[PDB]
Structures are given as structure tokens and as C-alpha cells.
């Protein structure tokens, strides 16, 4: 955080997708690649590519409940995790103006897996928390697929040196949902590892 001038940013991308049948029990598989990541879980492959963002994900968590798959792509401690999410100031300017979080859903419902067992609902309304509104329009681009009834997505890109440097980079937020008349909420429960 010692203006090289390098900037250090973090990123969280949340994807929630409700499918058209109750979920089948699957084995989770995730892959992090250069400026993106993907996860195959619950009958859906969710892929996130970061276009002109100059940022890498470090972790993918998942959740599955009823008919809904959740994924959280995130960065971790930025000074101890490889690859380091640092960038020049000119690259941060381009991130600010041009970063797109390109989300792609692919249905992969597998009839060789039985339906998830369901006792009592493992999620409850007070597991979802409101998030602030978008401050960057059209940062999220989403492609859905036929088996998906609704998708919700949220991105937060933030300064890791904000508390610290003497100045801070504005947090960039966007939110997109196919749902109508629903509050701006995301699952805040701790996700499972993939």
C-alpha cells in the first residue's frame, strides 16, 4: 500500500440461481483461471470472467438449498495469497471505467444423481442481508440458460489499502436480478468450500 504506484483491490461476486426442479445431490468442482473462475454444482455450471478488471479470484464457496444454487467468488488476504491482486494506477483507472463482470450459466442437470434430501429448510429469511444499490450501471453482464427460473448477482470491488494510504478508491458495486419487486438481499450465511 506504498504507492509504487501500485493499487491493491479485492473483489466479491455473488451468484444465486433458482432452477426449475429441486436440486440433485452433486459433487462440487471449481476452477480458478486467469481473471475468472467457474464452479459446477447442483446442476449448474456458473462461470465468471473479469473483462478489463486486472483482478483474480482466490476462492469459490458454494451453497445449495431447495431449488437454488449459490456461488461466491472472492479474493482472500491480499498480501499473503498468490497471485497478488495488485495493479498500476492506470490499470485501476481502466478498471473503474471499463471492468465488466461477465457471468455465464450452463445447465448440467445430471439424472444419475438423486434429489437432495430435505428435512427442514436449512436456510431462513434472516440469513439474507440487504446490500447497497449499484453505483456502476451495467458492470454485470449475464447469460442464463433454460433450466434457470431466476438469477441474482452482485459484485463488490473494493480498496484493500483504504485504511491506510491517506486516501481511498471508491468501492464499485453492481446488482442485477431477473426477479421483480424483491428486496436487494444476498445470502450472508458462510458458504461451503468447493
From Swiss-Prot:
Main location group: secreted
Gene this protein is translated from: OPG170
Glycosylation sites: 45
Transmembrane intervals: none
Recorded family membership: Belongs to the orthopoxvirus OPG170 family.
Keyword annotations: Early protein, Glycoprotein, Host-virus interaction, Inhibition of host chemokines by virus, Secreted, Signal, Viral immunoevasion
Compartments (UniProt record): Secreted
One Gene Ontology CC term in the entry: extracellular region
Induction trigger: Expressed in the early phase of the viral replicative cycle.
Its job: May interact with several cellular chemokines to interfere with chemokine-glycosaminoglycan (GAG) interactions at the cell surface to alter chemotaxis of nearby responsive cells.
Name this polypeptide is given: Protein OPG170
